Design a protein around this ligand. Structure first.
Ligand SMILES: NC(=O)c1ccc[n+]([C@@H]2O[C@H](COP(=O)([O-])OP(=O)(O)OC[C@H]3O[C@@H](n4cnc5c(N)ncnc54)[C@H](OP(=O)(O)O)[C@@H]3O)[C@@H](O)[C@H]2O)c1
Lengths: 638, 262, 82
């Protein structure tokens, strides 16, 4: 209220001006009379991009390479989403690197365009924020220039690369050239020296010699003094390979357009066959390439678009699946990987591992880079440029921000309190936080665990690796509030307070005494100012990140019989607006109806998977109260 | 070429319970519904009654989803190769299911669940059990909307290893509720669409007979989930190593209207 | 004498898959010397570890298996000592 607050009191002056307009709702706030209105948020603002220090590339819609965007990375909290289950067993030592260039492989395009689902990848990546990108070239925490392969998402601006997967960029390669080496040559050594067991002088058949893995395979094979036969699409690829490798003559080249390479190679090997086959082509080219194998020949099939019968063979253990093995060795980082780490490091020193030709795409043309890789119209490595390499060779990376879409994440080292988190939306929202980073939950109920659905959910969080604690108390007195934060601070610093508690006594206003009007007012007027008083004091104030107080559209639309709930839901929203006035974090979802956890007031109940999609936007926004409701259909006349 | 099956989704047709199986609003034919069609077709070729034949389906590939339509007639063609058992459930010129169906007279079932009589979930507290309301609240949160016909799991343990599966004489429902045990064994948030059933053994000979006509209370058959072998076994049915593919969850309604209460 | 009863199963049923899987704590068997065929061959590849090897030396291979040998899909290890 301005310096001249109104004086509404019976026979006043301001009141009479208000008894003349006879407006139902009069609100004097910010110095002027007005009203509270719900202003629609355009669908374009839900994907509005804002500067963010840490970002990573994901897809808005699975299977669409045109939906690739940059979202907020959970590395702002220091850790990486997906630390549940099998990712909790391997305690790999990781070095945090500032990515400068990110190489785009065909593994990312296959996942991005829906050719393969995320579930085919190693099980350690199931809960990761993204699955795009493995190789990179940036700077470790000490400022050194390093390049390496890491579990996804490596199409990001910061990574946590295991120290057993990081190579040092020689002081002759720019970081741009380093971004092309790690995966192409690590795969080439795996296919040739680790799975094919190539020996000196052996004959190797390499499909798609113009691919980055194909170019790496030729370079590795030539170092082993091998007889190379390679499949080139057109004459441009043949010319490129010949110039790149002067040892390659035209006799060493065939066409990927027909299976006429079988007679040529069989005749040129005098019926001996090829010792190692690095197979990417499929169908009659896969059959014609096994048919070229020698008696002891090895067939390394690394194509991604396997048939249905081939996949069943993988499931039945009939054949090994070698197309996501470099991704699996990067999760374990064991004896088999350290063999590839040493083979590539030796190749770099001996000059075998040379950088490949590459095309550099900015961070905003991520979609176009993916399309360029998919089409395969021209040879080369597609390398996304995240940062600009400094002229020095050991220097700290400047702090910068990138435009990225919101993605709410929770600190895994902080404790999150969920008052009423042992219910329908309490337990399904808790599961959402567990996926987004939370690993320390204190769930509070008046009775604790009383059903087998609550006991099964909490036994699921605990199995995933979440430190859950269920308190059978009501936060309605300072003693109860103290206990909930004694248990929270014991688990870790408080980084979030959620109040999903609801109590409803629906009745006609005139058939309700005080004991029955104050029923819904405990979970909404007494647990919101005992959680707000405790969040405004040390040490909660500094550590706290989220203060979410769930509300209802009864404060914006009204309902019949819920006059006590409306009073409680409105005073809750006024405490959250006071928090914004003081600069404290606050979020107040104002939901209409939720389906999974019919038509009321002509509004369809939302599916929960969509409530959590708008909730994520609600948390990553500047407004206090956001009203989410679904309409049966846009209103017409009468 | 072989048996052509007509599914009558009419007001009072006996196969109207099949509209009580939806995924994110869309009505779908159950993935273990073409198994029964292949099962009934093979028995018809042999001339025997389908409930006296013990079959085994291996590597059943689900290529599409047969979208049911209320008050409509769906015609599907099942083709079974006489000697090798290669079967094909194909609607029009589009494949919906493929695999190999093999009959036998010996014991095909691996697990001994068909011999289990009672329910081991007796005397347990109400906080150590999952009831049909709690079981199908978890499926609904993942997009699997099952009506009263397809709500076969009447009780289960917190691990979902032990369950009480209802037997009502409808085999498409029963096979789906035995696949729900596999689904109930993989807690999560995403929607998984089955894409490959490595083995499905149906042995009606060890299965209880159809309930008397006009039955109101049906019997519950004990079911078990084996994590070691990945077998969902209840009665004379066994589903082994079912593989699923993540499905993008479609919105039943139109996008929500977000506003800023200011 | 080093062999105890825990080290023995029955060739009459594929009940050895659950026993061996449980006794290896889900790791599987590193080497499988396979002579039995059909559901015993399938239940024995299913016991293979991540790096496990399957040595099939049975002589009565199916028609599909022989075509796999012809197409170079699998190696024929039953007349390799010869
Ligand atoms: N899901 C919907 O249909 C819907 C629709 C619109 C808005 N909302 C919003 O979401 C919330 C309701 O979600 P929900 O009912 O589905 O699940 P929920 O919020 O988890 O359920 C309410 C929970 O409040 C707990 N509770 C009540 N008084 C408490 C107290 N004094 N101390 C601690 N806990 C207390 C209860 O625990 P006990 O049962 O153990 O006592 C109960 O589980 C409300 O904030 C509401 O504004 C929900």
């Amino acid at each position: 209220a301005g310096p001249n607050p109104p004086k509404i009191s019976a026979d006043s002056a301001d009141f009479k001006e208000l008894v003349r307009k006879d407006l139902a709702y009069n609100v004097f706030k910010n110095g002027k009379w007005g009203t509270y209105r719900g202003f629609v948020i355009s669908d374009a603002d839900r994907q509005k991009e804002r500067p963010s220090e840490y970002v990573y590339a994901d897809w808005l819609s699975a299977g669409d390479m045109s939906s690739l965007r940059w979202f907020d990375s959970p590395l702002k909290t220091g850790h990486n989403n997906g630390m549940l289950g099998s990712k909790m067993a391997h305690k790999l030592e990781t070095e945090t690197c500032s990515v400068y260039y990110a190489g785009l492989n065909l593994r990312d395009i296959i996942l991005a365009n829906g050719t393969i689902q995320r579930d085919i990848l190693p099980e350690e990546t199931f809960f990761k924020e993204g699955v795009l990108g493995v190789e990179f070239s940036g700077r470790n925490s000490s400022g050194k220039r390093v390049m390496g392969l890491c579990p996804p998402p490596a199409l990001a601006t910061t990574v946590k690369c295991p120290v057993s997967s990081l190579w040092s960029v020689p002081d002759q390669w720019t970081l741009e050239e380093a971004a092309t080496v790690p995966l192409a040559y690590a795969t080439a050594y795996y296919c040739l020296v680790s799975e094919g067991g190539v020996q000196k002088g052996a004959t190797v058949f390499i499909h798609a010699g113009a691919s980055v893995v194909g170019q790496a395979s030729i370079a590795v094979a030539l170092s082993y003094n091998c007889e190379i036969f390679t499949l080139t699409k057109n004459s441009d690829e043949t010319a490129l390979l010949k110039s790149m490798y002067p040892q390659l003559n035209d006799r060493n080249f065939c066409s990927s357009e027909d299976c006429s390479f079988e007679k040529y190679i069989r005749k040129e090997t005098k019926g001996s066959g090829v010792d190692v086959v690095i197979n990417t082509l499929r169908g009659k080219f896969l059959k014609a390439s096994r048919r070229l194998l020698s008696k002891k020949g090895k067939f390394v099939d690394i194509g991604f678009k396997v048939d249905s019968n081939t996949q069943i063979a993988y499931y039945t253990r009939e054949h090994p699946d070698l197309r996501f093995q470099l991704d699996a060795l990067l999760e374990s980082q064991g004896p088999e990987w350290t063999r590839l780490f040493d083979l590539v490091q030796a190749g770099i020193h001996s000059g075998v591992v040379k950088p490949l030709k590459r095309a550099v795409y900015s961070m905003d043309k991520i979609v176009d880079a993916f399309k360029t890789v998919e089409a395969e119209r021209e040879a080369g490595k597609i390398v996304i440029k995240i940062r600009d390499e400094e002229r020095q060779k050991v220097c700290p990376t400047p702090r910068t921000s990138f435009p990225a879409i919101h993605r709410t994440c929770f600190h895994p080292d902080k404790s999150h309190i969920l008052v009423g988190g042992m219910g329908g939306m309490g337990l399904e929202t808790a599961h959402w936080m567990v996926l987004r980073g939370a690993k320390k939950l204190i769930l509070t109920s008046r009775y604790g665990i009383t059903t087998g659905y609550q006991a099964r959910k909490i036994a699921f969080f605990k199995q995933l690796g979440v430190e859950v604690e269920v308190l059978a108390l009501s936060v309605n007195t300072r003693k109860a509030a103290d206990k909930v934060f004694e248990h929270a601070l014991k688990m870790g610093p408080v980084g979030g307070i959620f109040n999903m508690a609801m109590v409803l006594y629906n009745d006609d206003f005139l058939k309700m005494n005080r004991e029955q009007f104050l029923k819904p007012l405990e979970s909404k007027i007494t647990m919101t100012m005992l959680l707000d008083d405790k969040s405004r004091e040390k040490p909660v104030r500094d550590t706290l990140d989220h203060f979410v107080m769930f509300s209802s559209l009864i404060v914006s639309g009204g309902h019949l019989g819920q006059a006590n709930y409306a009073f409680g839901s409105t005073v809750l929203e006024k405490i959250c607006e006071r928090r914004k006035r003081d600069g404290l974090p606050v979020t107040t979802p104002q939901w209409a109806s939720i389906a999974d956890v019919t038509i009321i007031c002509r509004k369809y109940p939302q599916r929960f998977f969509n409530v959590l999609s708008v909730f994520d936007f609600m948390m990553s926004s500047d407004n206090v109260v956001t009203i989410s409701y679904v309409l049966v259909e846009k209103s017409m006349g009468v | 070429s072989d048996n052509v099956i007509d599914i009558d989704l009419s007001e009072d047709s006996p196969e109207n319970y099949l509209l009580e199986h939806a995924v994110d609003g869309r009505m779908l034919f159950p993935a273990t519904g073409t198994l029964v069609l292949a099962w009934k077709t093979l028995a018809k070729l042999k001339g025997v009654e389908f409930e006296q034949l013990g079959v085994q389906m291996t590597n059943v590939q689900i290529h599409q989803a047969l979208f049911l339509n209320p008050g409509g007639k769906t015609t599907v063609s099942v083709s079974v190769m006489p000697i090798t058992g290669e079967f094909q459930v194909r609607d029009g010129e589009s494949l919906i299911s493929s695999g190999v169906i093999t009959s036998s007279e010996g014991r095909l079932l691996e697990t001994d669940q068909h011999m289990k009589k009672g329910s081991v979930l007796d005397g347990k507290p109400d906080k150590e059990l999952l009831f049909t309301k709690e079981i199908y609240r978890e499926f609904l949160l993942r997009g699997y909307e099952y009506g009263a016909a397809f709500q076969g799991i009447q009780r289960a343990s917190l691990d979902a290893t032990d369950t009480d599966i209802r037997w009502d004489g409808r085999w498409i429902s029963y096979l789906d509720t035995v696949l729900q045990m596999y689904l109930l064994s993989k807690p999560g948030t995403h929607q998984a669409l089955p894409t490959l059933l490595e083995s499905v053994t149906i042995d009606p000979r060890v299965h209880p007979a159809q309930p008397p006509e006009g039955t109101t209370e049906f019997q519950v058959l004990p079911g078990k989930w084996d994590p070691v072998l990945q077998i969902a076994a209840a009665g004379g049915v066994e589903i082994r190593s079912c593989h699923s593919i993540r499905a993008s969850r479609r919105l039943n309604h139109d996008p929500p209207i977000l506003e800023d209460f200011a």
